[PDB]
PDB file of C-alpha atoms in Angstrom:
ATOM      1  CA  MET A   1      16.192  78.592 -51.841  1.00 33.91           C
ATOM      2  CA  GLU A   2      16.348  80.469 -48.394  1.00 33.38           C
ATOM      3  CA  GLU A   3      12.473  81.931 -48.814  1.00 35.64           C
ATOM      4  CA  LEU A   4      11.582  78.224 -49.422  1.00 34.53           C
ATOM      5  CA  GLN A   5      13.253  76.925 -46.389  1.00 39.57           C
ATOM      6  CA  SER A   6      11.658  79.529 -44.376  1.00 40.78           C
ATOM      7  CA  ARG A   7       7.984  79.033 -45.588  1.00 40.83           C
ATOM      8  CA  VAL A   8       8.480  75.237 -45.192  1.00 40.53           C
ATOM      9  CA  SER A   9       9.979  75.741 -41.618  1.00 43.76           C
ATOM     10  CA  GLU A  10       7.016  78.095 -40.642  1.00 45.44           C
ATOM     11  CA  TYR A  11       4.519  75.746 -42.080  1.00 45.51           C
ATOM     12  CA  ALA A  12       6.034  72.689 -40.165  1.00 42.51           C
ATOM     13  CA  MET A  13       6.576  74.574 -36.816  1.00 40.83           C
ATOM     14  CA  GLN A  14       2.909  75.930 -36.646  1.00 41.13           C
ATOM     15  CA  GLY A  15       1.459  72.442 -36.769  1.00 40.04           C
ATOM     16  CA  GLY A  16       1.818  71.717 -33.161  1.00 39.41           C
ATOM     17  CA  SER A  17      -1.536  71.422 -32.287  1.00 40.56           C
ATOM     18  CA  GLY A  18      -2.468  68.146 -33.849  1.00 38.51           C
ATOM     19  CA  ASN A  19      -3.352  69.521 -37.441  1.00 35.93           C
ATOM     20  CA  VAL A  20      -3.379  73.214 -38.887  1.00 37.39           C
ATOM     21  CA  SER A  21      -7.454  74.126 -38.572  1.00 37.74           C
ATOM     22  CA  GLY A  22      -6.617  76.057 -42.234  1.00 39.34           C
ATOM     23  CA  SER A  23      -5.318  75.052 -45.230  1.00 42.51           C
ATOM     24  CA  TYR A  24      -3.326  72.135 -46.434  1.00 44.38           C
ATOM     25  CA  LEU A  25      -0.627  73.233 -49.197  1.00 46.51           C
ATOM     26  CA  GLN A  26      -2.461  73.649 -52.441  1.00 47.53           C
ATOM     27  CA  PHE A  27      -0.573  72.474 -55.537  1.00 44.95           C
ATOM     28  CA  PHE A  28      -0.790  73.342 -59.045  1.00 45.52           C
ATOM     29  CA  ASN A  29       0.763  71.416 -61.689  1.00 45.27           C
ATOM     30  CA  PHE A  30       1.192  73.922 -64.419  1.00 45.37           C
ATOM     31  CA  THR A  31       3.096  71.411 -66.400  1.00 45.60           C
ATOM     32  CA  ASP A  32       0.765  68.594 -67.035  1.00 43.82           C
ATOM     33  CA  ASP A  33      -2.852  69.580 -65.998  1.00 41.44           C
ATOM     34  CA  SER A  34      -3.487  68.037 -62.708  1.00 38.93           C
ATOM     35  CA  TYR A  35      -4.551  69.577 -59.083  1.00 42.04           C
ATOM     36  CA  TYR A  36      -3.841  68.315 -55.904  1.00 40.02           C
ATOM     37  CA  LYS A  37      -4.017  69.092 -51.917  1.00 39.91           C
ATOM     38  CA  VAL A  38      -0.969  68.118 -50.046  1.00 40.50           C
ATOM     39  CA  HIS A  39       0.926  67.778 -46.791  1.00 42.79           C
ATOM     40  CA  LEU A  40       4.558  67.482 -46.060  1.00 38.00           C
ATOM     41  CA  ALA A  41       5.896  63.872 -45.808  1.00 31.72           C
ATOM     42  CA  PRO A  42       7.852  62.490 -43.261  1.00 31.20           C
ATOM     43  CA  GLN A  43      11.044  62.836 -45.648  1.00 28.35           C
ATOM     44  CA  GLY A  44      10.686  66.421 -45.439  1.00 28.49           C
ATOM     45  CA  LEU A  45      12.596  69.309 -47.256  1.00 27.39           C
ATOM     46  CA  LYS A  46      15.969  67.879 -47.599  1.00 23.19           C
ATOM     47  CA  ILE A  47      18.773  70.527 -48.847  1.00 23.45           C
ATOM     48  CA  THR A  48      22.219  69.608 -50.037  1.00 26.03           C
ATOM     49  CA  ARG A  49      25.250  70.965 -52.021  1.00 23.35           C
ATOM     50  CA  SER A  50      27.936  68.565 -52.948  1.00 24.09           C
ATOM     51  CA  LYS A  51      31.228  69.560 -54.497  1.00 26.35           C
ATOM     52  CA  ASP A  52      30.241  68.976 -58.049  1.00 23.84           C
ATOM     53  CA  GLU A  53      28.116  71.973 -59.340  1.00 21.46           C
ATOM     54  CA  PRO A  54      29.231  74.493 -56.380  1.00 22.03           C
ATOM     55  CA  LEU A  55      27.184  77.306 -56.906  1.00 21.57           C
ATOM     56  CA  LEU A  56      23.948  75.381 -57.721  1.00 21.18           C
ATOM     57  CA  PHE A  57      21.547  74.268 -54.878  1.00 20.74           C
ATOM     58  CA  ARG A  58      19.552  71.283 -54.867  1.00 22.49           C
ATOM     59  CA  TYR A  59      16.151  70.275 -53.229  1.00 21.83           C
ATOM     60  CA  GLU A  60      14.303  67.275 -52.307  1.00 19.53           C
ATOM     61  CA  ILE A  61      10.785  67.326 -51.523  1.00 17.87           C
ATOM     62  CA  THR A  62       8.385  64.351 -50.649  1.00 13.29           C
ATOM     63  CA  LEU A  63       4.506  65.040 -50.060  1.00 14.55           C
ATOM     64  CA  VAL A  64       1.482  63.045 -49.376  1.00 13.26           C
ATOM     65  CA  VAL A  65      -1.846  63.653 -51.370  1.00  9.20           C
ATOM     66  CA  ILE A  66      -5.039  64.518 -49.237  1.00 10.49           C
ATOM     67  CA  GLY A  67      -7.324  64.877 -52.216  1.00 13.11           C
ATOM     68  CA  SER A  68      -8.057  66.507 -55.529  1.00 10.78           C
ATOM     69  CA  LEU A  69      -8.380  70.575 -55.059  1.00 11.20           C
ATOM     70  CA  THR A  70     -11.470  70.295 -57.202  1.00 11.85           C
ATOM     71  CA  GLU A  71     -13.346  68.900 -54.134  1.00  6.01           C
ATOM     72  CA  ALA A  72     -14.270  71.099 -50.990  1.00  6.13           C
ATOM     73  CA  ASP A  73     -13.435  69.976 -47.552  1.00  5.10           C
ATOM     74  CA  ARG A  74     -15.241  66.699 -46.184  1.00  8.33           C
ATOM     75  CA  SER A  75     -16.727  67.968 -43.310  1.00  8.71           C
ATOM     76  CA  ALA A  76     -17.313  71.631 -44.470  1.00  9.04           C
ATOM     77  CA  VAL A  77     -19.940  70.137 -47.168  1.00 10.65           C
ATOM     78  CA  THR A  78     -23.513  71.808 -46.558  1.00  8.86           C
ATOM     79  CA  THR A  79     -25.981  69.049 -45.865  1.00  8.67           C
ATOM     80  CA  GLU A  80     -29.425  69.169 -46.956  1.00  6.96           C
ATOM     81  CA  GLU A  81     -30.985  70.397 -43.573  1.00  8.49           C
ATOM     82  CA  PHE A  82     -34.365  70.579 -44.675  1.00  8.25           C
ATOM     83  CA  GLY A  83     -36.998  70.988 -41.984  1.00  9.14           C
ATOM     84  CA  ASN A  84     -35.335  71.901 -38.649  1.00  9.60           C
ATOM     85  CA  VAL A  85     -32.362  70.392 -37.156  1.00  5.02           C
ATOM     86  CA  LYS A  86     -32.573  72.568 -33.845  1.00  4.73           C
ATOM     87  CA  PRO A  87     -36.371  71.584 -32.698  1.00  5.98           C
ATOM     88  CA  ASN A  88     -37.959  73.897 -30.041  1.00  4.89           C
TER      89      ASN A  88
ATOM     90  CA  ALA B   1      78.273  74.623 -83.340  1.00  5.54           C
ATOM     91  CA  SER B   2      81.026  72.874 -81.448  1.00  5.46           C
ATOM     92  CA  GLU B   3      80.705  70.133 -78.646  1.00  4.54           C
ATOM     93  CA  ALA B   4      82.690  72.247 -76.277  1.00  5.35           C
ATOM     94  CA  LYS B   5      80.468  75.594 -76.871  1.00  5.13           C
ATOM     95  CA  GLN B   6      77.151  74.300 -77.613  1.00  6.26           C
ATOM     96  CA  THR B   7      74.151  75.327 -75.269  1.00  9.89           C
ATOM     97  CA  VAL B   8      71.774  72.502 -75.939  1.00  9.26           C
ATOM     98  CA  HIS B   9      71.716  68.523 -75.505  1.00  8.06           C
ATOM     99  CA  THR B  10      71.573  66.126 -78.491  1.00 11.77           C
ATOM    100  CA  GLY B  11      71.308  62.674 -79.451  1.00 11.36           C
ATOM    101  CA  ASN B  12      75.024  62.412 -80.161  1.00 10.63           C
ATOM    102  CA  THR B  13      76.134  64.190 -76.828  1.00 10.67           C
ATOM    103  CA  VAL B  14      74.464  61.754 -74.289  1.00 13.15           C
ATOM    104  CA  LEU B  15      75.415  58.018 -73.232  1.00 13.46           C
ATOM    105  CA  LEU B  16      72.863  55.830 -71.437  1.00 14.55           C
ATOM    106  CA  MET B  17      74.493  53.906 -68.891  1.00 11.86           C
ATOM    107  CA  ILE B  18      72.941  50.595 -67.512  1.00 14.64           C
ATOM    108  CA  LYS B  19      74.536  48.672 -64.632  1.00 14.90           C
ATOM    109  CA  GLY B  20      77.855  50.315 -65.338  1.00 14.61           C
ATOM    110  CA  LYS B  21      77.972  49.627 -69.036  1.00 16.96           C
ATOM    111  CA  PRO B  22      76.956  52.030 -72.052  1.00 15.70           C
ATOM    112  CA  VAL B  23      73.880  50.905 -73.966  1.00 16.43           C
ATOM    113  CA  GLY B  24      74.761  50.059 -77.505  1.00 19.20           C
ATOM    114  CA  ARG B  25      72.714  51.035 -80.416  1.00 16.81           C
ATOM    115  CA  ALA B  26      69.567  52.484 -78.929  1.00 15.91           C
ATOM    116  CA  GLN B  27      67.071  54.644 -81.132  1.00 14.59           C
ATOM    117  CA  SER B  28      65.225  56.652 -78.295  1.00 13.26           C
ATOM    118  CA  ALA B  29      64.664  56.945 -74.657  1.00 11.68           C
ATOM    119  CA  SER B  30      61.510  58.509 -73.075  1.00  9.72           C
ATOM    120  CA  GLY B  31      60.581  59.316 -69.572  1.00  9.48           C
ATOM    121  CA  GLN B  32      57.134  60.212 -68.306  1.00  8.73           C
ATOM    122  CA  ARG B  33      56.884  61.108 -64.422  1.00 10.53           C
ATOM    123  CA  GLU B  34      53.313  62.490 -63.297  1.00  9.74           C
ATOM    124  CA  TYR B  35      52.523  63.348 -59.741  1.00 10.97           C
ATOM    125  CA  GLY B  36      48.776  62.990 -60.313  1.00 11.04           C
ATOM    126  CA  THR B  37      48.639  66.724 -59.190  1.00  7.40           C
ATOM    127  CA  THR B  38      44.744  67.570 -58.490  1.00  7.44           C
ATOM    128  CA  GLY B  39      42.990  70.648 -57.476  1.00  6.77           C
ATOM    129  CA  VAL B  40      40.860  70.729 -54.082  1.00  9.69           C
ATOM    130  CA  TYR B  41      37.573  72.324 -54.795  1.00 11.97           C
ATOM    131  CA  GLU B  42      34.812  73.691 -52.394  1.00 11.62           C
ATOM    132  CA  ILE B  43      31.237  74.497 -52.254  1.00 11.82           C
ATOM    133  CA  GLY B  44      30.297  78.055 -52.864  1.00 12.44           C
ATOM    134  CA  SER B  45      33.640  78.885 -54.867  1.00 11.24           C
ATOM    135  CA  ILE B  46      34.091  77.709 -58.320  1.00  8.09           C
ATOM    136  CA  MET B  47      37.869  77.504 -58.366  1.00  9.34           C
ATOM    137  CA  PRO B  48      40.270  75.324 -56.608  1.00 10.27           C
ATOM    138  CA  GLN B  49      42.155  76.989 -53.738  1.00 11.53           C
ATOM    139  CA  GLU B  50      45.343  74.580 -53.835  1.00 11.63           C
ATOM    140  CA  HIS B  51      46.755  71.683 -55.691  1.00  9.87           C
ATOM    141  CA  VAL B  52      47.903  68.313 -54.057  1.00 10.31           C
ATOM    142  CA  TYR B  53      49.967  65.487 -55.214  1.00 10.67           C
ATOM    143  CA  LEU B  54      48.627  61.885 -55.469  1.00  9.92           C
ATOM    144  CA  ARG B  55      50.880  59.018 -56.609  1.00  7.58           C
ATOM    145  CA  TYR B  56      54.439  59.287 -58.102  1.00  7.95           C
ATOM    146  CA  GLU B  57      53.754  57.755 -61.635  1.00  9.91           C
ATOM    147  CA  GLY B  58      57.368  57.265 -62.983  1.00  9.39           C
ATOM    148  CA  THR B  59      58.388  55.558 -66.144  1.00 11.09           C
ATOM    149  CA  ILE B  60      61.231  55.354 -68.663  1.00  7.90           C
ATOM    150  CA  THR B  61      60.882  53.657 -72.098  1.00 10.43           C
ATOM    151  CA  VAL B  62      63.848  52.410 -73.894  1.00 12.66           C
ATOM    152  CA  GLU B  63      63.931  51.542 -77.825  1.00 11.53           C
ATOM    153  CA  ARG B  64      66.746  49.746 -79.074  1.00 12.90           C
ATOM    154  CA  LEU B  65      68.038  47.892 -82.386  1.00 13.49           C
ATOM    155  CA  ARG B  66      68.819  43.992 -81.578  1.00 13.98           C
ATOM    156  CA  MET B  67      72.522  43.627 -81.048  1.00 13.15           C
ATOM    157  CA  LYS B  68      73.504  40.316 -82.281  1.00 13.06           C
ATOM    158  CA  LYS B  69      74.161  39.021 -79.113  1.00 12.99           C
ATOM    159  CA  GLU B  70      74.119  40.774 -75.517  1.00 11.82           C
TER     160      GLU B  70
END
């Protein structure tokens, strides 16, 4: 749980330039076959531990889907570029 | 064996007195007193660290054979 909190903290804090130039989080649903690219929702990683179940931690995560993991980035797609885009 | 030497209380050695008079021809009297005692638990440790007392739930039942009057 602490490793998870530290990953999440590190990913959130480094995003102070509008948006990370690198990857969004890549999500694998190993249970029902489906794959997504995702970003931390404004609910964030809410961690709690009540009186009931004293020795068990609980975590609540909310995310927003950017797109399917099957599709590469929009701007990164290599266009046709036949002929010459940089005329002499 | 004898009343003057026995170590235990019995139905025959006790009288039940209400408003200064003995109750006649009772069959049983039973009293429950419960403090609502409850332990105080804690995150991180599974066992409670003290008990505390809530409400003095105090009761007595009287069962009696009906005297012809009174």
